[PDB]
Amino acid sequence: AKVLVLYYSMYGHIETMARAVAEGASKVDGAEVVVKRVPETMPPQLFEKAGGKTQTAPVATPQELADYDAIIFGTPTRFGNMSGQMRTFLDQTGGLWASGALYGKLASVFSSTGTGGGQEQTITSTWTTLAHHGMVIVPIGYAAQELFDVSQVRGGTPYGATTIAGGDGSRQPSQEELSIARYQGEYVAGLAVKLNG
Amino acid sequence: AKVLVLYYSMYGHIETMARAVAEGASKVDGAEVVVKRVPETMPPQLFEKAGGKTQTAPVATPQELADYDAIIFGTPTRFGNMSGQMRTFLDQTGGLWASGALYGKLASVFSSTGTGGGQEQTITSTWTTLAHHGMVIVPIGYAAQELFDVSQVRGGTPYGATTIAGGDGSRQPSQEELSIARYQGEYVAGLAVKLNG
Amino acid sequence: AKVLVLYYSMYGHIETMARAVAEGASKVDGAEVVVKRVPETMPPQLFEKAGGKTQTAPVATPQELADYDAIIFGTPTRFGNMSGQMRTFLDQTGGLWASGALYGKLASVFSSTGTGGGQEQTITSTWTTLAHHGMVIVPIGYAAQELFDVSQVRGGTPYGATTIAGGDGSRQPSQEELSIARYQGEYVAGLAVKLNG
Amino acid sequence: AKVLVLYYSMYGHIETMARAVAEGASKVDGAEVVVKRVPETMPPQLFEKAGGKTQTAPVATPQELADYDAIIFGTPTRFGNMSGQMRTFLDQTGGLWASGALYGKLASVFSSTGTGGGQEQTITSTWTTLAHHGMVIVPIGYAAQELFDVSQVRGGTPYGATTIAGGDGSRQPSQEELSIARYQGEYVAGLAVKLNG
Ligand SMILES: Cc1cc2nc3c(=O)[nH]c(=O)nc-3n(C[C@H](O)[C@H](O)[C@H](O)COP(=O)(O)O)c2cc1C
Ligand SMILES: Cc1cc2nc3c(=O)[nH]c(=O)nc-3n(C[C@H](O)[C@H](O)[C@H](O)COP(=O)(O)O)c2cc1C
Ligand SMILES: Cc1cc2nc3c(=O)[nH]c(=O)nc-3n(C[C@H](O)[C@H](O)[C@H](O)COP(=O)(O)O)c2cc1C
Ligand SMILES: Cc1cc2nc3c(=O)[nH]c(=O)nc-3n(C[C@H](O)[C@H](O)[C@H](O)COP(=O)(O)O)c2cc1C
Ligand SMILES: O=C1C=CC(=O)C=C1
Ligand SMILES: O=C1C=CC(=O)C=C1
Numbered sequence: 001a002k003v004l005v006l007y008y009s010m011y012g013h014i015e016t017m018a019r020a021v022a023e024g025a026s027k028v029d030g031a032e033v034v035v036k037r038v039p040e041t042m043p044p045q046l047f048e049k050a051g052g053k054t055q056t057a058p059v060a061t062p063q064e065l066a067d068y069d070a071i072i073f074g075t076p077t078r079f080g081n082m083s084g085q086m087r088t089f090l091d092q093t094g095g096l097w098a099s100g101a102l103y104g105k106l107a108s109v110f111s112s113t114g115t116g117g118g119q120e121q122t123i124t125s126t127w128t129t130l131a132h133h134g135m136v137i138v139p140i141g142y143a144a145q146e147l148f149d150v151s152q153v154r155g156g157t158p159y160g161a162t163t164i165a166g167g168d169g170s171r172q173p174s175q176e177e178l179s180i181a182r183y184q185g186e187y188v189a190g191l192a193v194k195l196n197g
Numbered sequence: 198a199k200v201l202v203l204y205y206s207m208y209g210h211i212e213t214m215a216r217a218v219a220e221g222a223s224k225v226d227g228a229e230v231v232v233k234r235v236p237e238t239m240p241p242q243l244f245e246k247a248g249g250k251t252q253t254a255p256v257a258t259p260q261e262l263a264d265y266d267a268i269i270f271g272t273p274t275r276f277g278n279m280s281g282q283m284r285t286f287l288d289q290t291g292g293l294w295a296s297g298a299l300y301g302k303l304a305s306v307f308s309s310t311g312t313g314g315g316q317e318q319t320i321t322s323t324w325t326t327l328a329h330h331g332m333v334i335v336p337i338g339y340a341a342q343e344l345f346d347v348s349q350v351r352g353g354t355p356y357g358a359t360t361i362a363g364g365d366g367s368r369q370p371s372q373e374e375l376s377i378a379r380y381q382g383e384y385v386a387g388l389a390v391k392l393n394g
Numbered sequence: 395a396k397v398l399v400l401y402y403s404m405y406g407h408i409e410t411m412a413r414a415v416a417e418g419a420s421k422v423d424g425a426e427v428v429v430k431r432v433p434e435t436m437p438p439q440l441f442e443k444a445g446g447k448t449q450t451a452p453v454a455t456p457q458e459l460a461d462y463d464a465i466i467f468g469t470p471t472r473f474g475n476m477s478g479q480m481r482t483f484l485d486q487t488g489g490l491w492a493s494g495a496l497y498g499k500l501a502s503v504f505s506s507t508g509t510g511g512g513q514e515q516t517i518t519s520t521w522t523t524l525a526h527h528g529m530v531i532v533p534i535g536y537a538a539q540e541l542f543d544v545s546q547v548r549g550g551t552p553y554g555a556t557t558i559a560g561g562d563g564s565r566q567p568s569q570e571e572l573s574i575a576r577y578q579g580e581y582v583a584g585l586a587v588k589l590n591g
Numbered sequence: 592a593k594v595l596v597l598y599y600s601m602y603g604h605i606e607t608m609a610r611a612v613a614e615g616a617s618k619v620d621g622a623e624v625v626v627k628r629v630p631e632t633m634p635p636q637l638f639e640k641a642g643g644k645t646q647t648a649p650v651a652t653p654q655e656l657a658d659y660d661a662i663i664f665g666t667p668t669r670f671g672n673m674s675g676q677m678r679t680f681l682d683q684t685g686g687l688w689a690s691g692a693l694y695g696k697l698a699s700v701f702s703s704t705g706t707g708g709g710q711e712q713t714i715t716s717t718w719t720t721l722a723h724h725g726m727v728i729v730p731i732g733y734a735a736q737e738l739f740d741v742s743q744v745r746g747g748t749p750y751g752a753t754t755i756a757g758g759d760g761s762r763q764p765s766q767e768e769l770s771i772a773r774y775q776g777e778y779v780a781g782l783a784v785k786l787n788g
């Protein structure tokens with residue numbers, strides 16, 4: 001089964017998450033895992049002057065999403081929605097839509113926020129778009145036991161893994177957060193191989 | 198695979214849809230299909246006086262949901278949410294939740310409204326609860342060609358089948374609505390068999 | 395202006411919150427603030443054997459919601475939705491709906507969850523129902539500065555105040571949580587008096 | 592009060608709706624009404640080749656949103672979300688957010704879809720972003736009587752006006768759709784005047 005982790009990250013928090021998802025997915029015997037990022041939409045100079053992080057994952061084309069059995073989408077929040085970059089990219093999947101190219105493919109979503117607010121809404125509102133493509137939607141529920149832990153500030157929801165970046169972007173994904181992310185990749189890769197070999 | 202069509206209906210619109218869903222699911226050779234209803238929560242005499250429809254379907258218990266590989270939930274809208282009767286029933290699945298009894302099972306949703314408004318929000322707000330149980334969420338996308346017909350008033354969304362009951366409840370599910378409902382039953386059942394045998 | 399804080403609470407966390415909302419609302423010159431709870435739907439004996447908390451707020455009728463200028467709804471989550479009790483109560487507002495009794499009234503929502511997951515979805519999915527009644531929806535945004543604080547586990551979202559009850563129900567609303575709740579009551583009471591005197 | 596009708600349109604459906612909204616808002620004597628569009632993000636030549644409609648409305652800047660008492664946002668759907676063009680624009684309101692520049696301002700949303708699906712989800716997913724800015728969210732409920740008509744295919748929801756463009760974009764907003772749009776403009780404008788003078 002082929003698994004794409006398709007993400008947008010400006011400052012690396014979703015990048016770090018995407019890597020953990022990919023690691024989880026790679027634990028599954030029979031899973032081919034690929035990590036790509038969606039195109040930047042900001043002018044390059046503005047991206048750099050805002051301190052955007054350069055990334056080594058290659059940029060995806062809309063067209064190549066058809067090659068996968070499971071796509072795990074990562075996006076930071078922009079006010080409770082997916083980022084403009086992820087939105088812009090999904091807006092170019094109209095050809096895939098008309099041909100039913102993503103229909104019945106597995107989809108799962110992970111997110112990042114500055115201070116937590118909007119992390120559920122970002123995921124569930126991404127699910128909407130996935131549903132229009134007829135993708136099978138995979139939440140993670142409460143299998144990841146870190147989800148019960150209210151002793152420390154922690155991303156992660158039954159809807160998909162999340163990370164809390166701090167208001168100033170200074171926080172890094174915590175071990176509990178990355179554990180949920182790895183769980184998500186492995187669970188979805190498992191389902192992918194179950195259905196597609 | 199075992200497929201439960203679990204529904205709530207007061208005036209029979211969801212009940213009719215539920216039979217169409219069961220009918221589609223039954224086309225799938227590996228699929229054992231059962232139709233049950235959630236308990237009425239209204240006093241029996243207020244229900245009669247309101248003109249409520251009597252229904253032959255057996256009443257489900259919360260516990261028996263664990264016995265199935267896929268549950269397709271039918272509910273009328275109450276102001277853009279599932280009905281209090283469906284909510285009440287799902288609020289009694291806390292034991293199933295704690296044991297992960299519905300985790301990884303397939304879930305799909307269909308709905309009915311008086312005049313169309315809230316039909317999307319009912320389905321996707323229902324998906325939220327399904328996600329807490331770690332259920333795999335199954336939208337229908339646009340495989341059902343009737344979803345492209347805008348020549349007549351008709352329910353059905355990429356999220357799941359719907360019906361339009363009319364302001365006074367006098368409309369009956371149309372051929373196109375029932376056909377989307379059958380498709381949804383077949384699609385979910387085929388996925389249930391693909392996953393579980 | 396008259397402000398109703400209308401809540402459901404089984405174990406007191408939303409009750410404690412509702413009291414803080416009411417206190418906030420009472421700081422506003424010209425605001426008449428009333429606190430009532432919706433009816434219990436569980437059999438009384440089961441309510442007691444589950445350790446349900448007895449409450450001194452009187453039970454509201456659906457009919458009396460028409461008397462207010464602003465209604466602040468409090469509910470704990472049941473899997474990312476409002477509780478069955480709140481759902482059941484709102485389902486009896488069909489008379490108010492047909493007469494436009496809540497149309498243009500202010501509405502705001504606060505929630506409680508065991509471990510955080512579903513707290514955004516509970517609020518925004520309650521907003522849906524409020525919208526069908528034509529209520530003006532009041533989120534709190536980021537005016538409450540505790541919302542920037544990622545140093546301690548903390549409820550509260552830009553959508554409305556929330557509290558984290560702990561998996562076992564043992565946590566009590568924190569000062570930061572109650573501060574956001576008080577903010578919400580006062581902000582909404584302010585708007586109520588601005589519009590209605 | 593100053594009322595901004597801010598929209599994105601590729602094929603003119605939202606543009607037509609936007610003019611109807613402006614028209615309704617202008618009926619309110621205290622209301623100064625301005626119609627602006629968000630920038631196109633497609634290369635100018637891809638836009639022409641796609642058959643995009645040229646539009647006379649001035650292009651808004653993110654900053655000038657601060658100047659208004661009420662903003663009514665129009666966007667076509669992209670798979671159940673606002674369009675990438677609207678998302679991109681709203682992603683540039685981080686300065687306004689940090690200064691609380693839109694806090695307490697009125698917000699209301701209208702949408703357009705090819706065949707109806709995603710019309711609710713587009714509006715309410717847009718409300719999420721509005722809530723992060725602390726905007727007061729203004730749904731239309733069922734004051735517009737056309738919302739009770741199920742005799743013809745027509746957009747319009749309790750969340751805000753919508754139009755149905757057809758699969759090929761050939762439908763024009765109907766009389767009933769435009770009338771819901773006018774109502775929404777009038778209602779929001781009257782609220783803007785009631786709050787701000
Ligand atoms: C336009 C804009 C809107 C944002 N909205 C939110 C928000 O609603 N809630 C929040 O917690 N953080 C918000 N943030 C913070 C981003 O989500 C955060 O910087 C991102 O998660 C970091 O992930 P990345 O490093 O992968 O880019 C916003 C940031 C920008 C630039
Ligand atoms: C409390 C209440 C709330 C309702 N809210 C809506 C609504 O928001 N939108 C709508 O189109 N119909 C609404 N209706 C209509 C019901 O959804 C409709 O009667 C139901 O779909 C009929 O399905 P059934 O025959 O299976 O019970 C409402 C009805 C009641 C009693
Ligand atoms: C049926 C049921 C479902 C629940 N679902 C969730 C949930 O999805 N997320 C969560 O964090 N807590 C969940 N809980 C916990 C309740 O939300 C928590 O006990 C409540 O917030 C306490 O508030 P109260 O004391 O006012 O009743 C659930 C509890 C029950 C009984
Ligand atoms: C990328 C893309 C995604 C779309 N997704 C949907 C959709 O989910 N549902 C729908 O009914 N129409 C969909 N459409 C149709 C547009 O919403 C429709 O063309 C638009 O409402 C026309 O409005 P406008 O003329 O103002 O641009 C989509 C179109 C594009 C280009
Ligand atoms: O190009 C497109 C037009 C309409 C739609 O729904 C999807 C793609
Ligand atoms: O009793 C219960 C309490 C909380 C929950 O999430 C499930 C069951």
Ligand SMILES: O=C1C=CC(=O)C=C1
Pocket residue numbers: 311364487488489491492
């Ligand atoms: O009683 C009723 C209340 C609301 C509605 O939409 C339909 C019936």
Ligand SMILES: O=C1C=CC(=O)C=C1
Pocket residue numbers: 114684685686688689
């Ligand atoms: O620059 C920024 C503006 C707003 C926000 O929420 C995070 C970063």
